[PDB]
Amino acid sequence: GNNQQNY
Amino acid sequence: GNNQQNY
Amino acid sequence: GNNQQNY
Amino acid sequence: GNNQQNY
Amino acid sequence: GNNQQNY
Amino acid sequence: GNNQQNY
Amino acid sequence: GNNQQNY
Amino acid sequence: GNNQQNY
Amino acid sequence: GNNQQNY
Amino acid sequence: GNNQQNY
Amino acid sequence: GNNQQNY
Amino acid sequence: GNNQQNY
Amino acid sequence: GNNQQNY
Amino acid sequence: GNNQQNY
Amino acid sequence: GNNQQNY
Amino acid sequence: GNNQQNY
Amino acid sequence: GNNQQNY
Amino acid sequence: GNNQQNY
């Protein structure tokens, strides 16, 4: 699906 | 499904 | 915090 | 905190 | 705390 | 605390 | 405490 | 305490 | 925080 | 099913 | 079923 | 069934 | 299903 | 924070 | 922050 | 799907 | 899909 | 899709 990554 | 990762 | 919305 | 909503 | 809602 | 709701 | 609801 | 509800 | 919306 | 992990 | 883990 | 674990 | 991980 | 909108 | 909109 | 990464 | 990276 | 990179 849609992807958001907050490192 | 949709993905959110908060490191 | 961080926000992801999948309509 | 962090938020993910899947409608 | 952290929030996930699956409608 | 942390929240998960599956409608 | 922590919350999980399965409707 | 911690909460789980299965409707 | 950071924002991603998928309409 | 749907997945939420709070480390 | 649906999964919530609070470490 | 549905799963909640509070460590 | 849909995925949220809070490290 | 940073913004991405997909209409 | 930085902005990207996809109409 | 659509991608947003915040390093 | 569409891509936004914030280094 | 469309690309924006902020170094």
Measured at the CA of K2, the angle between CA H7 and CA F1, to 5 degrees, comes to 85
Measured at the CA of F5, the angle between CA G4 and CA C4, to 5 degrees, comes to 125
Q: Resolution limit in angstroms?
A: 1.1
What subunits touch chain H, counting only 3 or more CB pairs under 8 A? G, L
- CB-CB contact of D1 with E3 (8 Å): yes
Is E4 touching M (CB cutoff 8 A)?
Answer: yes
Calpha distance O5→D7 (Å, rounded): 21
What subunits touch chain Q, counting only 3 or more CB pairs under 8 A? N, O, P, R
**Amino acid of residue J5:** Q
Does the beta-carbon distance from M6 to D6 stay under 8 Å? no
Q: Tell me how far apart the 2 most distant CA atoms of chain F are, in Å.
A: 19
Q: Which residue of L has its CA nearest to K1?
A: L2
Contacts of P1 (CB under 8 A, 6+ apart): A1, A2, A3, B2, I6, Q1
Calpha distance K6→P2 (Å, rounded): 29
Give the CA distances from residue L2 to residues E5, J2, J6, in Å, rounded to whole numbers and listed in that order: 15, 10, 17
Give the CA distances from residue G4 to residues E2, F2, L5, P7, Q5, in Å, rounded to whole numbers and listed in that order: 12, 9, 10, 31, 33
Calpha distance C7→E7 (Å, rounded): 10
Task: Name the method of structure determination.
Answer: electron diffraction
Residue matched to tokens 């913004």:
N3
